[PDB]
Amino acid sequence: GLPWYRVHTVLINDPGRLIAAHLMHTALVAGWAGSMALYELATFDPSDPVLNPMWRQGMFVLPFMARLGVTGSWSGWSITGETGIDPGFWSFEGVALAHIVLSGLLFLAACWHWVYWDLELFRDPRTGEPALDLPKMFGIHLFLAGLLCFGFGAFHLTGLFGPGMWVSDPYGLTGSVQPVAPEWGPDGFNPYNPGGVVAHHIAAGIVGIIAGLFHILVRPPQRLYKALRMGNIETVLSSSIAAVFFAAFVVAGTMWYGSATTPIELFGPTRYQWDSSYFQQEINRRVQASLASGATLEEAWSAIPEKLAFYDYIGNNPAKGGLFRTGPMNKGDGIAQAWKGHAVFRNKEGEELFVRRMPAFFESFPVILTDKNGVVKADIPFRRAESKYSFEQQGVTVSFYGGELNGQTFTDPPTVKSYARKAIFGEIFEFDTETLNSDGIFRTSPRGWFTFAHAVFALLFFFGHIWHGARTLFRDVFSGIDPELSPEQVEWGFYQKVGDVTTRR
Amino acid sequence: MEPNPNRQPVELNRTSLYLGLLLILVLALLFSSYFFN
Amino acid sequence: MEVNQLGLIATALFVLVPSVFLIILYVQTESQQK
């Protein structure tokens, strides 16, 4: 009989049951989407998009609903922190319900197509054998994909008939769903320009409609039909898998580097924003402008939004996690409650000192403080017997500006050292570690988990492409090589051209 | 070895599968609350 | 709710072990010569 790893090959010559199996797969995926959304809605805390947004809470499908304009709950809240909104039917709950109902209908259709597999439609009218005209099916499906692609861009993304898409400022402070006009100049190919996403779907859709019509109306050349085995449905599997691992690498890349379709209020900040101190620079810019406008130091730092300071913290860096450190980021450092304010360290001479920040590479990192020129001025020693730079010897103090601790100064060395240890992580926050029994160890965000799964799946699908491409092009020898294989066809010297008996010397 | 003449095939028909799965699932639906307690 | 932490594994095995026993017996009945 068939070995276990070939049981599904019974579908190769059975278009009706292949459709049924595809319907069942589609029902399972749609049912996963609905169940996943319900699980997230049953666990999501919507009360604080500033310090407890969805990406701190392990939310995976919630950002995908929000990205395309589903932002409110039937219970009255929205992910931008609004109250008393009416989302209509297409709330998060309505989306979940729709996917569950779709799942059930697809399941019922699968049953019908499994039972009534022997449809005359699936028989070649000349031979009576099962037959799918895959070249024309491609045209039909490409035309349909083009129309849908075009409509998604022309109506949904533009807001002409639809909600638009999530957009935000460069620091992820004020994101919302907006209509987006297409960008038809070279900046439309900028991954951070949302108008290019709109233009893409309009233009690629039109191209898809035209190519679909071409593929409906023009038969494949004989040379290509034979070379790619266009009568063998497994050739379609091979090239479809190739296209899918290409797409999967692309979405892994744009998730990891960031783009207009992976916004930081939905998936969390990127590792590169920590590498380049992206948020620290903007914070420092704003504080300096406040100071240049006559503000006090307390006023300047108190003007920094808590949301901006929170991005300047390594616990939100997606490159700080662990493969088996499971769950939401909140399970590690805790549920963020409030910014403690900006810590300024000074030595006994009054020089401002700066804590060296932890790079993402390091699970642990020493505490070293430098002056504005990078000269070491204090640290936390390991060996004490030859310590020169201890906080006790250098009289290190810490004063806070903005946040909970605004206006306070600490001089007790253990307390000052405690705050210096938090400053290697960037801006300092107060956390609720009790509610979730948080363990104090950093976890990655949905940006990280998405990137991991899709890079891994893409690489595995490379193997599937190779395997099914091989099976397509070598179908004649899948059961072994010709038992009477001419030894002259593999020995040297007999044929001028390898494998061509008509070139026999 | 010489074959053992006492062997017999075993059977479970589809109706018995459905009855047994119903028994197990309903027993589980009943007892799970007490297991979680 | 503070449920017993073994309730999940107890319920899962309570379902799985006898259900699998029946599935094994059913499938090997179907595969017998008719």
Partner: peptide, 30 residues
């Protein structure tokens, strides 16, 4: 996790109903 467990078992029962009715052993006169 307990709600998931209860709803899962219920869902398996409803699925069993479906198979027991529409994929039963057909009654046959012989």
């Amino acid at each position: 996790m307990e709600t998931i467990t209860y709803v899962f078992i219920f869902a398996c029962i409803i699925a069993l109903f479906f198979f027991a009715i529409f994929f039963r052993e057909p009654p046959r006169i012989t």
